[PDB]
A and B are shown apart, each in its own frame.
Chain A
Amino acid sequence: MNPIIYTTLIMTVMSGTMLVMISSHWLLIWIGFEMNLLAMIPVLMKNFNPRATEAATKYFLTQATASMMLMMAIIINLLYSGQWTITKMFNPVAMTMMTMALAMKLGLSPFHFWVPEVTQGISLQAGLLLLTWQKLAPLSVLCQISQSINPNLMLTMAMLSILIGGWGGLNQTQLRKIMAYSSIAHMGWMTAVLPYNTTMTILNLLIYITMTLAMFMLLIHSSATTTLSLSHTWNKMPVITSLMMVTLLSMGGLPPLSGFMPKWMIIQEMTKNESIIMPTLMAMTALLNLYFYMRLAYSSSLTMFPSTNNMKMKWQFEHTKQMKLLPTMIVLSTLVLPMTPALSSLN
């Protein structure tokens, strides 16, 4: 992708996404998705390896199909209501018909299949764009239509996402697959509170975004995609793997780190709505997330790992790359718990 066009490659993804938040007409919300979709494919193949073309295509059929279902849910609602404004659906099946589609856009239900698969082929930088930005657009629609979503529908699909998402993480050794299942589980965390209160899903979305931002920052900086290659990084840069641990603790949600507040606030709000068994169930299942975080941490900084001799060549040089903002996200996504009341700003 030519640098100058690589910029507008990403520009329409952002504006195509931005169309989803700012529009009030259902067709425009529909239009914002393929503009995101059609421009998201080439950057996934920016490296252009056979794995990249493999990764991009499974995204396309999954995403195009989801947008295809998105279209009728608009139409049946239009047929049964005659309005395009983003409000509650006036026909129950159209509601469930949309919620089914937006999940495939989101990787919540068994649809979650496509998420770990595409993450492997697409590069770390592309993954940084995928699990973070490509989730904002579906969330905005769900928050707007939150009035008339079937509570037992959203809760069930949220519960499974944290179930398989946490459980599938306890098999992988490639960091990208581990990361995707972690994102899949976090996908469930926000979406469980979606019917009750939509402020919390933004709050957990924000914490998820900055943490996953800072997470990939470290992965690019370590330039590793396999635990063994990451295990090496204790030698060349111990600071990178030292902070690798701390943000991995925020993964599990272990207090007093930032990652606790999403789980904390959601459980509080859900308990206000007399759902106590459900928050308790995801609370236990979140330990599976923390488990492969710990093993990932174990091979990172608690225990030294066999390095090589040609790596002492690396000691002479350093990262000429930067990308700004890694220092900010480590701080923002690790030490922010003493600022819970700021969540009311989202309100």
Chain B
Amino acid sequence: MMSGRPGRVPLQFLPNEARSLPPPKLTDPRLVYMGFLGYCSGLIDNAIRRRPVVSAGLHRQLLYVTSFVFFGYYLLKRQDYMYALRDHDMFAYVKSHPEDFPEKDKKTYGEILEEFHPVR
């Protein structure tokens, strides 16, 4: 980081414990942008093949958006899972290693002495 994580199973898109995380919503803005990305591929394909860029090959456009949305949805599941995994051993290490992580008794500004810079 985490290819050496214990229990890590290579060549497995989504491991089992990932399902315990909240699945991305259908109306997730990042997901719908991926669909919008699929739309943009539709215009270009009609443009390269010099077809009507807005009404030709609606079947092609329909495939061009759904495929992006699917691979999008699975990608965000993995996206959330790794960030959750990184946050997991995060808090596992802080609890198992108290000494190396000092919690200084931070004290209010009435007791600290920060120099004032007279600007002019």
A contact set with B: CB distance below 8 Å:
199, 221, 237, 239-240, 243, 318-319, 322, 326-328, 330-332, 335-336, 338-339, 341-342, 344-345, 347
Residues of B within 8 A of A199 (CB): 1
- A327 and B33 form a contact (CB under 8 A): no
B82 touches A347 (CB 8 A): yes
**When the two chains form the complex, which single residue of B37, B48, B64 contacts A240, counting CB atoms closer than 8 Å?**
B48
CB distance from B52 to the nearest CB of A (A): 13
Contact of B83 among A237, A239, A344 (CB under 8 A): A344
Q: Which residues of B contact A318 (CB under 8 A)?
A: 50
12 of the cross-chain contacts (CB-CB < 8 Å) are A239-B47, A243-B44, A327-B41, A327-B42, A327-B48, A328-B41, A330-B44, A331-B37, A332-B37, A342-B76, A345-B82, A347-B86
Mask, B33-66, CB within 8 Å of A = 1, is 1100100111011011110000000000000100
Q: What's the nearest-Cβ distance from chain B to residue A244, in Å? A: 12
Q: Chain B contacts of A330 at CB under 8 A?
A: 41, 44
Q: How large is the interface on B (under 10, 10 to 19, 20 to 34, 35 or more residues)?
A: 20 to 34
Chain B contact residues, majority secondary structure: helix
Instruction: Contact check, B78 vs A345: say whether CB atoms are below 8 A apart.
Output: yes
Chain B residues with a Cβ under 8 A of chain A: 1-2, 30, 33-34, 37, 40-42, 44-45, 47-50, 64, 75-76, 78-79, 82-83, 86
Give the distance in Å from the alpha carbon of A132 to the alpha carbon of B111 in the complex: 61
Q: Kindly list chain A residues whose C-beta atoms are within 8 Å of the C-beta of B42.
A: 327
**Chain A nearest CB, measured from B79 CB (Å):** 5
- Chain A nearest CB, measured from B40 CB (Å): 5
User: Which residues of the other chain, A, contact B34 by a CB distance below 8 angstroms?
Assistant: 339
Residues of chain B contacted by A327 (CB below 8 angstroms)? 41-42, 44-45, 48, 64
| B1 x A331 contact (CB < 8 A) | no
Evaluate contact between A331 and B40: CB separation under 8 angstroms.
Answer: yes
Which residues of chain A have C-beta atoms less than 8 A from B75's C-beta?
Answer: 342, 345
- Residues on A with C-beta less than 8 A from B37 are 331-332, 335-336
CA distance A330 to B1 in the complex (A): 30
Nearest B residue to A347 via CB reads B82
Tell me the complex Cα distance, A35–B107, Å: 66
Chain B residues, Cβ within 8 Å of A237: 50
Q: Contacts of A243 on B, CB cut-off 8 Å?
A: 44, 47
Tell whether, in the assembled complex, residue A339 and residue B2 are in contact, meaning their CB atoms are under 8 Å apart.
Answer: no
Query: Is the pair B79, A344 in contact by a Cβ cutoff of 8 Å?
Result: yes
Q: B50: which A residues are within 8 A, CB to CB?
A: 237, 239, 318
Chain B residues, CB < 8 A from A322 = 49
Check if A344 sits within 8 Å of B44, measured CB to CB.
no
Min CB gap A267→B, angstroms: 19
**CB <8 Å contact, B2 and A347:** yes
